[PDB]
Scaffold this motif. Structure first.
Motif, PDB file in Angstrom:
ATOM      1  N   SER A  52       0.865  -1.202   0.000  1.00 42.05           N
ATOM      2  CA  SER A  52       0.000   0.000   0.000  1.00 42.05           C
ATOM      3  C   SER A  52       0.893   1.241   0.000  1.00 42.05           C
ATOM      4  CB  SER A  52      -0.950  -0.061   1.176  1.00 42.05           C
ATOM      5  OG  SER A  52      -1.718   1.117   1.296  1.00 42.05           O
ATOM      6  N   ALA A  53       0.333   2.385   0.351  1.00 38.20           N
ATOM      7  CA  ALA A  53       1.094   3.632   0.418  1.00 38.20           C
ATOM      8  C   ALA A  53       0.344   4.618   1.298  1.00 38.20           C
ATOM      9  CB  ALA A  53       1.283   4.160  -0.972  1.00 38.20           C
ATOM     10  N   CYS A  54       0.976   5.758   1.563  1.00 39.70           N
ATOM     11  CA  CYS A  54       0.347   6.884   2.290  1.00 39.70           C
ATOM     12  C   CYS A  54       0.049   7.995   1.288  1.00 39.70           C
ATOM     13  CB  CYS A  54       1.262   7.368   3.406  1.00 39.70           C
ATOM     14  SG  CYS A  54       0.593   8.782   4.324  1.00 39.70           S
ATOM     15  N   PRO A  55      -1.179   8.537   1.247  1.00 38.43           N
ATOM     16  CA  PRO A  55      -1.494   9.617   0.326  1.00 38.43           C
ATOM     17  C   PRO A  55      -0.676  10.850   0.670  1.00 38.43           C
ATOM     18  CG  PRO A  55      -3.500   8.609   1.187  1.00 38.43           C
ATOM     19  CD  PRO A  55      -2.348   8.119   2.032  1.00 38.43           C
ATOM     20  N   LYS A  56      -0.025  11.423  -0.339  1.00 40.21           N
ATOM     21  CA  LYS A  56       0.847  12.608  -0.177  1.00 40.21           C
ATOM     22  C   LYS A  56       0.152  13.815  -0.798  1.00 40.21           C
ATOM     23  CE  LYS A  56       5.629  14.202  -0.730  1.00 40.21           C
ATOM     24  NZ  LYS A  56       5.965  14.074   0.702  1.00 40.21           N
ATOM     25  N   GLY A  57       0.303  14.968  -0.151  1.00 33.07           N
ATOM     26  CA  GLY A  57      -0.217  16.257  -0.642  1.00 33.07           C
ATOM     27  C   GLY A  57      -1.654  16.514  -0.220  1.00 33.07           C
ATOM     28  N   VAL A  58      -2.292  15.608   0.518  1.00 30.20           N
ATOM     29  CA  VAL A  58      -3.680  15.837   1.012  1.00 30.20           C
ATOM     30  C   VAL A  58      -3.696  15.613   2.519  1.00 30.20           C
ATOM     31  CG1 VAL A  58      -4.805  15.247  -1.163  1.00 30.20           C
ATOM     32  CG2 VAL A  58      -4.310  13.452   0.517  1.00 30.20           C
ATOM     33  N   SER A  59      -4.645  16.252   3.194  1.00 31.69           N
ATOM     34  CA  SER A  59      -4.979  16.010   4.613  1.00 31.69           C
ATOM     35  C   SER A  59      -5.609  14.621   4.734  1.00 31.69           C
ATOM     36  CB  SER A  59      -5.898  17.078   5.110  1.00 31.69           C
ATOM     37  OG  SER A  59      -6.405  16.750   6.377  1.00 31.69           O
ATOM     38  N   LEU A  60      -5.234  13.889   5.788  1.00 31.97           N
ATOM     39  CA  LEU A  60      -5.685  12.499   6.063  1.00 31.97           C
ATOM     40  C   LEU A  60      -6.893  12.505   6.996  1.00 31.97           C
ATOM     41  CD1 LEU A  60      -2.273  10.678   6.491  1.00 31.97           C
ATOM     42  CD2 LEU A  60      -3.983  10.264   4.712  1.00 31.97           C
ATOM     43  N   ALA A  61      -7.581  13.636   7.154  1.00 35.90           N
ATOM     44  CA  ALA A  61      -8.671  13.787   8.146  1.00 35.90           C
ATOM     45  C   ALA A  61     -10.053  13.510   7.536  1.00 35.90           C
ATOM     46  CB  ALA A  61      -8.609  15.161   8.755  1.00 35.90           C
ATOM     47  N   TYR A  62     -10.163  13.235   6.235  1.00 35.11           N
ATOM     48  CA  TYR A  62     -11.478  13.177   5.533  1.00 35.11           C
ATOM     49  C   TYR A  62     -11.970  11.737   5.376  1.00 35.11           C
ATOM     50  CZ  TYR A  62     -10.323  17.999   4.314  1.00 35.11           C
ATOM     51  OH  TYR A  62     -10.027  19.325   4.383  1.00 35.11           O
ATOM     52  N   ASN A  63     -13.293  11.579   5.377  1.00 32.76           N
ATOM     53  CA  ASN A  63     -14.001  10.330   5.004  1.00 32.76           C
ATOM     54  C   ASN A  63     -13.755   9.204   6.003  1.00 32.76           C
ATOM     55  OD1 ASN A  63     -15.295  11.269   2.679  1.00 32.76           O
ATOM     56  ND2 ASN A  63     -13.352  11.114   1.565  1.00 32.76           N
ATOM     57  N   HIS A  64     -13.347   9.508   7.237  1.00 30.68           N
ATOM     58  CA  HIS A  64     -13.085   8.464   8.263  1.00 30.68           C
ATOM     59  C   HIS A  64     -14.336   7.602   8.426  1.00 30.68           C
ATOM     60  CE1 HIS A  64      -9.603  10.830  10.326  1.00 30.68           C
ATOM     61  NE2 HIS A  64      -9.377  10.525   9.029  1.00 30.68           N
ATOM     62  N   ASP A  65     -15.532   8.215   8.401  1.00 33.86           N
ATOM     63  CA  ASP A  65     -16.841   7.532   8.592  1.00 33.86           C
ATOM     64  C   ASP A  65     -17.145   6.580   7.423  1.00 33.86           C
ATOM     65  OD1 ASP A  65     -17.628   8.446  11.070  1.00 33.86           O
ATOM     66  OD2 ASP A  65     -18.770  10.154  10.273  1.00 33.86           O
ATOM     67  N   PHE A  66     -16.509   6.747   6.267  1.00 30.15           N
ATOM     68  CA  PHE A  66     -16.859   5.994   5.040  1.00 30.15           C
ATOM     69  C   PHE A  66     -15.684   5.112   4.635  1.00 30.15           C
ATOM     70  CE2 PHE A  66     -21.009   7.613   4.055  1.00 30.15           C
ATOM     71  CZ  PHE A  66     -21.053   8.802   4.750  1.00 30.15           C
ATOM     72  N   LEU A  67     -14.635   5.052   5.452  1.00 33.51           N
ATOM     73  CA  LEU A  67     -13.547   4.064   5.233  1.00 33.51           C
ATOM     74  C   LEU A  67     -13.854   2.842   6.099  1.00 33.51           C
ATOM     75  CD1 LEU A  67     -10.472   6.434   4.958  1.00 33.51           C
ATOM     76  CD2 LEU A  67     -11.628   5.180   3.123  1.00 33.51           C
ATOM     77  N   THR A  68     -14.639   1.933   5.519  1.00 31.02           N
ATOM     78  CA  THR A  68     -15.232   0.781   6.233  1.00 31.02           C
ATOM     79  C   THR A  68     -14.628  -0.500   5.668  1.00 31.02           C
ATOM     80  OG1 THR A  68     -17.126   0.763   4.761  1.00 31.02           O
ATOM     81  CG2 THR A  68     -17.355   2.013   6.835  1.00 31.02           C
TER      82      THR A  68
END
Lengths: 637, 630
Positions: free
Chosen positions: B408-424
């Motif tokens: 896998s990888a870590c998304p770069k250039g974006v905030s990691l705070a979004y869509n926590h409720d929809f990462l199921t």
């Protein structure tokens, strides 16, 4: 059609006849009462006074002209003459029989003889109503004639020795009823398949018009035939009606219909519409002479899962940031003085279902108009009294009202244009995979009308049971949850919007159905469940029917499955809702159907569940004779 | 340049050879069968062999070499004094109670000298500003004290404990087994959270150290009250390659990043795709390669995976799917001259052992910054040999007795705070759109998990006294379910159930190896956490080809800690399960839950009835409650 400036009703100059006021509605209403309580030695006579009132062909004439008008297809003048003769013959012989058995005193031997005159009259004459090259019109006539014959046989079997039937003769009638109720269904679907398939290739709008006719004049009766061996069931029709607006589409195969398009129209079958989105483009030239609008995609969003819906067509803006989602872009362009666009508009249009006690659209006014020679062409989109789009074409686009009394708008979808429909059938499922179909455009909008009897389920997502109902029908598509690798199968002869096909090879196959009890429900009354399913191959562990209530799971029936090509009706042992621990306050109560994993040959279908009170339900015609060891052959004696 | 081993010039110590390995092996034995009044003494011989701090010295230098952190010389001398005091008082106690004849009253006093020594010295190992090194030392001193407490409870009057004194030790055990867990997580969270903000690679390196030196022992604490269970570690190790990432918060880790790393938590990798771009200027002096996306595809559902980063081609038919595009451009001498955009695919071989074992993945920035490129290689199969002129050095990713489970990888250039409720775990696509990644992350799972990930089924051996089913190793799971990082459970995480209406459930597939004694009596231990009351409780079931048995109806009154529920005895004959059964499940279900009722599932433990006992109860025997103070 383009020179005529008339307000239109589903693409016609006149409003259509309301579904409740069609010629066959009194026949269907009578059959609903007969299937709940059969009048012995009177059932056929009361059916005859609805099919042939006053010993006339008047109702069969009214059926023909209603159907010819709706299909815009006509029988030949000479064929009408022939059918008049055949009606006269059936009326003559059947009046003789019913006049005889309605005397206070009659001879049972003569009644036996005049019964068989009536039966063999129908056997020899029926093929006159399978009219080659006119299947669209004759399927509605053939339906009633088979219904007439099946009602006669049923009344004879329950009559027994009162109409001079010995035990062995009563067994020969049961053998014919069981043979004909399958053969008539086969011969019915032969007519429907030919005509539906022919029109899918000619014109999708005309094909939906024919399926809509059959949903009202044909399939309610095929379902009545499957219920005819019983007493204390419910005749119900949950088939949806579909209306088409836009440019012509053709060259669709039945495999295209079943594998893709019908799944695309149905969306989430167990949910009501929330909102539908349209991919709109507008284009105007420098000289203000050209005004063209296009719909490139439709995205229906339903009230919930487990189905996942995507674009039918596409949601892309063409002619103009990919990680950004653009909903609208306007463009005004001026050029040097010495077809190039001057104004373009690309917009995602949204039609939102109101949030109220009645969260459904009733009517729609959607139309597409091409003005010769092709400079103007535009769209109007309007649900109920809410304008989604008023055409930016300068001239006015006529009203095209879509409505059916006692129906509501359940689904809004489209047919992909400019691509083959033969792809991804195996991955167009009820769950997991996105229900979408990419195409360069659609240039059509399809609207699905579901009858008002389904409003309670789609409003609440539960099957509310009243203690005053002798019977309740749970269509397979009105589920709460379903296992993966499950498909929507079009089975219109069931008078539903379809069946569930289970194909998961490893984990197992199950559908759950949420049920509630209306206040004052009698949890002491004894009930039974009828499970209708087709399983063409033997399942080692069979099919299980269960109740689940808040951790309290009961096994209601283990169905032995030895494999059969036809639809099977398993009837559970009696139970009460006290046995299941369900009350008028239970809120996590389900009926469930489950099997193990199935290979390619073991893939089976679930049509519906019927809940019946034990006290009123009886099998009146058995699958096997009582006395004789085997049914006679149709061969030489 | 020099070959590297996970970004270091020197290879790291193999996991099986770390200084705590013998301590973990003994605890695995003692958890199967406890030696009454010998458990503490045998544990002392592993933590302080020959009455020396030699093992604790080896642990400190190993962990210091691993984290590149060091205790001050003055703090080192203090700890030596602490170890001496603990050793001296522990040896006096153990020598006295190992005599042929001793006085119970004297043994009683020497016990409290040892117990109260540990209690007053323990905070010397919660070193403020040095929790990274000190967490492994604090872990072993807590293990030492819980061992002594258990043996005190089983010895009873033999070591001078009256029944009321025995109850007070049970009260202290139950308090300290939770309190030591909490004080452990405080050390872990401070250091893990500190390194997430500093450098994600340095942070994963700390979690990897805890997954070997720390979290096996926190699990051992939770099993110490029983006898006849199995101690197991299924934590994955994570390796990072690429450009630095920083300023990640712990909330982003739990809510997004960890879910993206785990992919489909119940499946093996099938293939992984890389979004690759190559750029070369007109002068042939600039050669730059970038990785813009990783798309891991696993063996099956119910999880749906998507791009981490993006699969788009920048710097160039939206209906057609382009897999590769080359460009050669010639200008007027009087900017790019060659560009390549490609979807690279690394495909796991289809064999009796369908797993990558090792990887050689490296990114190098050649100062002044003209050259920068990637090598990507799994096992002996080269996916990408860098088009940079100079050779990019080897970077071997491997752990002996581990295999590659996830890429896998870590998304770069974006905030990691979004869509926590929809990462199921289900329904929603497990993706996170970003302009680039410029990093690749590899998850190594231990070899003990191979059997499950190979067959998607828990095969049970008749010769094994206990079997652990980690919650994430499921067949099916309900919607609105989340992966919850719970590394103190010595697994890759727990399931969080949040469905409000339909219900919450999870099935685990089980098979019986040929020669399985179907008449043996077994019990199930269900570890869950349900903070609020559930009116209908939690149900545990067996399902087999239609035959569905309820094994236990858990009453949930509501508790903030991890609760173990032990079912009544049962045989596989009772469940109708044989060695020819292929549709056998263990199931756990509850009704809909609101926000306060959301609960977690850690693991199931199958244990033989004959060898399983609760040796330390959750309540005192004689006294009604644990003593109050005032």
């Amino acid at each position: 059609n383009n020179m005529i400036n008339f307000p239109m009703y589903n693409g016609r100059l006149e409003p259509s006849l309301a579904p409740a006021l069609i010629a066959v509605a009194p026949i269907a209403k009578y059959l609903a009462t007969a299937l709940a309580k059969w009048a012995v030695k009177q059932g056929f006579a009361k059916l005859k006074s609805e099919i042939f009132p006053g010993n006339t062909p008047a109702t069969m004439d009214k059926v023909r002209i209603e159907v010819q008008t709706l299909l815009d297809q006509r029988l030949q003048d000479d064929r009408v003459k022939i059918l008049e003769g055949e009606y006269k013959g059936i009326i003559d012989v059947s009046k003789v029989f019913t006049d005889y058995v309605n005397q206070s005193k009659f001879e049972t031997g003569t009644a036996n003889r005049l019964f068989f005159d009536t039966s063999n009259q129908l056997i020899s004459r029926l093929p006159q109503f399978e009219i080659a090259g006119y299947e669209g019109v004759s399927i509605s006539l053939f339906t009633q004639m088979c219904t007439f014959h099946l009602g006669l046989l049923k009344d004879g079997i329950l009559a027994g020795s009162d109409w001079g039937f010995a035990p062995a003769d009563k067994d020969a009638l049961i053998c014919q009823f069981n043979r004909f109720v399958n053969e008539y269904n086969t011969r019915l679907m032969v007519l429907y398949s030919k005509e539906f398939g022919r029109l899918l290739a000619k014109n999708l709008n005309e094909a939906l018009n024919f399926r809509n006719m059959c949903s009202l004049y044909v399939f309610p009766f095929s379902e009545a035939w499957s219920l005819l061996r019983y007493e204390g069931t419910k005749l119900e029709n949950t088939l949806s009606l579909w209306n088409f607006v836009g440019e012509s589409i053709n060259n669709i195969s039945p495999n295209d219909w079943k594998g893709a398009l019908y799944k695309l129209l149905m969306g989430a079958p167990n949910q009501r519409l929330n909102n539908v989105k349209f991919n709109y483009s507008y284009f105007s030239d420098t000289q203000a002479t050209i005004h063209r609008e296009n719909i490139h995609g439709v995205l229906p969003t339903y009230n919930g899962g487990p189905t996942i819906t995507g674009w039918i067509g596409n949601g892309r803006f063409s002619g103009l940031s990919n990680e950004l989602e653009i909903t609208k872009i306007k463009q005004e362009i001026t050029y040097n003085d010495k077809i190039v666009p001057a104004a373009t508009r690309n917009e995602i249009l949204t039609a939102t279902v109101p949030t109220s006690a009645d969260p459904f659209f009733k009517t729609a006014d959607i139309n597409w108009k091409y003005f010769s020679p092709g400079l103007y062409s535009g769209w109007n989109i309007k649900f109920d009294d809410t304008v989604t789009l008023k055409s930016r074409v300068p001239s006015i686009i006529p009203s095209n009202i879509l409505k059916y009394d006692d129906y509501y708008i359940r689904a809004v979808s489209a047919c992909p244009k400019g691509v083959s429909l033969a792809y991804n059938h195996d991955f167009l499922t009820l769950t997991y995979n996105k229900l979408e179909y990419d195409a360069p455009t659609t240039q059509n909008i399809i609207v699905g009308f579901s009858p008002d009897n389904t409003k309670s389920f789609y409003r609440s997502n539960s099957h509310y049971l009243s203690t005053t109902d002798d019977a309740y029908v749970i269509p397979a598509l009105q589920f709460s949850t379903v296992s993966d690798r499950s498909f929507l199968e079009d089975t219109p002869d069931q008078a539903t919007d379809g069946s569930i096909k289970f194909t998961d090879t490893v984990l197992g196959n199950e559908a759950k159905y949420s049920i509630r009890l209306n206040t004052g429900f009698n949890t002491a009354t004894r009930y039974r469940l009828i499970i209708r399913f087709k399983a063409p191959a033997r399942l080692a562990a069979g099919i299980r029917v269960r109740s689940q209530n808040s951790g309290n799971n009961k096994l209601l029936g283990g169905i032995p499955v030895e494999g059969n090509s036809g639809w099977i009706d398993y009837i559970t042992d009696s139970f009460t809702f006290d046995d299941l621990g369900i009350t008028t306050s239970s809120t996590n109560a389900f009926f469930s159907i489950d099997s193990d994993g199935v290979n390619a040959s073991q893939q089976w279908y679930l049509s519906k569940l019927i809940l019946v009170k034990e006290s009123s339900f009886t099998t009146q015609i058995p699958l096997k004779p009582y006395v004789i060891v085997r049914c006679p052959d149709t061969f030489f004696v």
